[PDB]
Each structure stands twice: as structure tokens, then as C-alpha cells.
Amino acid sequence: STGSATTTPIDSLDDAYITPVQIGTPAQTLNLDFDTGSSDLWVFSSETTASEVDGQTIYTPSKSTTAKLLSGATWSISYGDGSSSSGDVYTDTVSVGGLTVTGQAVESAKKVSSSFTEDSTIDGLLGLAFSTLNTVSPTQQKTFFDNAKASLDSPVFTADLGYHAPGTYNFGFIDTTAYTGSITYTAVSTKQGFWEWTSTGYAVGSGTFKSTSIDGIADTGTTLLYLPATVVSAYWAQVSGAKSSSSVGGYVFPCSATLPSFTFGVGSARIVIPGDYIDFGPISTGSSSCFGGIQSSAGIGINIFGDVALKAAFVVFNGATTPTLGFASK
Numbered sequence: 001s002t003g004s005a006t007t008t009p010i011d012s013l014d015d016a017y018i019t020p021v022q023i024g025t026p027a028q029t030l031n032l033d034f035d036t037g038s039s040d041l042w043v044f045s046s047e048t049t050a051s052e053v054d055g056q057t058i059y060t061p062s063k064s065t066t067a068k069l070l071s072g073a074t075w076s077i078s079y080g081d082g083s084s085s086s087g088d089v090y091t092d093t094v095s096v097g098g099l100t101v102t103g104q105a106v107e108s109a110k111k112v113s114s115s116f117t118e119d120s121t122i123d124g125l126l127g128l129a130f131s132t133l134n135t136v137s138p139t140q141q142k143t144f145f146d147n148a149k150a151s152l153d154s155p156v157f158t159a160d161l162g163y164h165a166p167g168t169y170n171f172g173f174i175d176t177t178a179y180t181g182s183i184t185y186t187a188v189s190t191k192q193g194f195w196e197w198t199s200t201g202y203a204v205g206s207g208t209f210k211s212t213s214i215d216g217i218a219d220t221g222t223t224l225l226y227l228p229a230t231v232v233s234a235y236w237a238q239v240s241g242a243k244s245s246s247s248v249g250g251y252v253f254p255c256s257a258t259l260p261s262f263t264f265g266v267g268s269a270r271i272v273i274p275g276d277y278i279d280f281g282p283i284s285t286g287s288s289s290c291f292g293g294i295q296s297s298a299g300i301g302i303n304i305f306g307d308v309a310l311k312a313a314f315v316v317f318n319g320a321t322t323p324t325l326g327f328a329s330k
């Protein structure tokens with residue numbers, strides 16, 4: 001079997017992408033944030049604290065004839081950006097673009113942190129990292145991809161995120177018309193539960209490629225590209241007026257600047273992120289200072305190849321016996 005769904009930026013900056021997911025019987029369509037950096041499928045629901053719900057679509061397990069409460073199971077997650085959510089668990093039928101999984105654990109939220117409430121366009125998350133990171137206690141649950149894998153034509157899913165445009169998540173197949181040239185595959189470590197790989201280096205604009213190993217995770221659930229301070233300083237040094245702002249929380253640059261591109265290595269292959277992909281607009285409404293799309297990972301503890309990097313490429317999340325990552329230009 002296969003599945004194919006359109007993914008859409010939530011706003012004019014591509015802060016995040018949402019993909020419609022059908023849950024339950026009859027179907028309840030919720031727009032979820034597909035996240036290759038986490039492994040919980042959680043949704044805003046009829047059980048979410050009323051004051052923590054602001055415009056999101058909710059899952060009502062009592063209205064699904066296939067919904068079954070998973071006895072004694074609870075979940076609680078805390079994300080890298082400080083956000084959090086928790087609740088109880090149901091098992092239900094979940095479909096993504098024609099691909100169906102019965103008995104999928106659907107984590108129903110009782111509490112969500114303020115930033116989830118503040119984002120009315122994201123109805124919950126669909127975790128696509130390895131199931132070893134799933135937070136369901138006392139019995140850990142599998143991801144949608146893990147549950148579907150054996151049924152898929154090929155044990156893979158692809159991320160094809162658009163820059164200011166719609167894109168696609170495909171499951172079970174590789175759309176050979178969605179990229180140019182060939183897909184270069186690279187080794188993945190699953191030790192931390194992430195799609196963790198090693199970039200062979202980088203270049204800034206038309207500058208010399210620097211061969212250096214950058215261990216990081218392919219994360220669709222993180223907006224920006226988080227890289228070592230040495231690499232990030234080398235990037236922003238090419239932008240007139242750019243500086244690291246302690247008050248803003250990162251590198252900022254004059255909104256009138258035209259940003260250089262950023263190339264990252266995948267083996268001997270190169271993915272070029274165009275400069276416009278690195279502009280995250282004014283730091284505050286009406287400001288002429290803009291926020292950068294490449295930021296230091298010094299505070300996080302891990303390098304993150306978030307949407308800024310991934311949207312420049314066609315990305316294969318290969319769930320073969322030995323999982324690997326594939327990248328192609330497009």
C-alpha cells in the first residue's frame with residue numbers, strides 16, 4: 001500500500017507545516033504537524049482544558065465507533081522549544097492520504113502549554129522519529145510509520161516541503177518526478193531515537209566548501225537550521241549589519257539585505273538552501289530588523305536540520321532493516 005498527502009505552511013514565514021489526517025469512524029479530519037523529531041501522535045481533543053483551546057479542531061473519541069481507551073495509559077511530552085502537552089490514550093483508525101492504520105495510538109490531550117494554544121492552525125502532532133522516543137506509559141506505543149511499515153510497498157516515507165508553497169508527504173514509495181538528479185543516501189544512527197546523520201560540510205554563498213563533520217537530526221518539526229556556532233558565525237559574517245542579539249535570542253540582520261545561500265554536504269552531494277529561505281521577517285511587527293533562519297545550536301545540545309534545510313531537498317526517510325536518509329535536489 002501507499003499514502004500521499006499535501007503539506008501546507010501554517011503562515012507566510014513557513015514557521016511549520018500541517019497535513020490533514022483522518023482519525024476515527026466517521027472520519028475526524030485534523031491538521032497535524034508531521035514531526036520527524038518526535039514519536040507521539042497527539043491531538044487537541046474534547047478532553048483538552050477549555051481555556052487551552054483556541055481555534056483548533058478537536059478529536060472527540062466518544063463520537064468514534066472504532067475508538068478504544070487504552071487502559072491506564074498516559075503520555076506527557078516536553079519539546080526542545082519549551083512547549084509541552086499530556087493526556088490519556090485511545091487506539092483508533094488513522095489515515096494519511098489514502099494509507100490506513102487500525103489500532104494506532106492516538107494520544108488525547110488533557111493539557112497543552114501556551115504556545116500550542118496560541119497556534120490555532122496546528123491541531124496536534126504526528127511523530128515520525130523512532131518509536132523508542134514515544135512517551136506512552138506504562139506501555140510505549142508505535143508511530144504511524146512503524147505501524148504501516150510492513151504493509152507499505154517500500155518501507156519509506158518522503159518529505160517534500162515547499163518554500164511558500166504546498167508540498168507532499170508520501171508513504172511507501174519514491175516519486176521519481178519530485179526531484180532532480182539522484183538521491184544520495186547517508187548513514188543514520190538511531191541511538192538517540194532521531195533520524196541522526198552526519199553532514200560532510202558546508203559553504204556560504206559562492207564561497208569554498210568546508211569539509212567538516214556535522215552530526216545533526218533531520219527534523220521536520222523544527223522551523224530553523226541549527227548549526228555549530230563556528231558555522232553560524234561564518235554564515236552571518238557574510239551579511240552586512242548582521243549580529244547576534246541577546247535580547248532577540250539569535251542572529252538578526254537588516255530586512256533590506258539579500259541573504260547568501262547556504263550549502264550543506266550529503267556525502268559528495270550538495271544541497272543548496274537559497275538565501276530567501278533564511279529570511280524569517282521582522283523580529284517584531286513593523287521592525288526593520290529581521291530574524292535569521294540559521295541559528296547556533298550551542299544552547300540546544302544537538303545540531304538540527306529543520307525545515308529551512310529540508311525544504312531545499314527531497315528527503316527520503318528510509319525505514320529499511322538498517323535505516324538511512326536520502327537527499328536529492330529538486
Ligand SMILES: c1cnc2c(c1)ccc1cccnc12
Nearest residue numbers: 015223224248280282283291
Ligand atoms: C522560529 C523561531 N524563531 C523565530 C521564527 C521562527 C520566526 C520569526 C522570529 C522573530 C523573532 C524571534 N524568533 C523568531
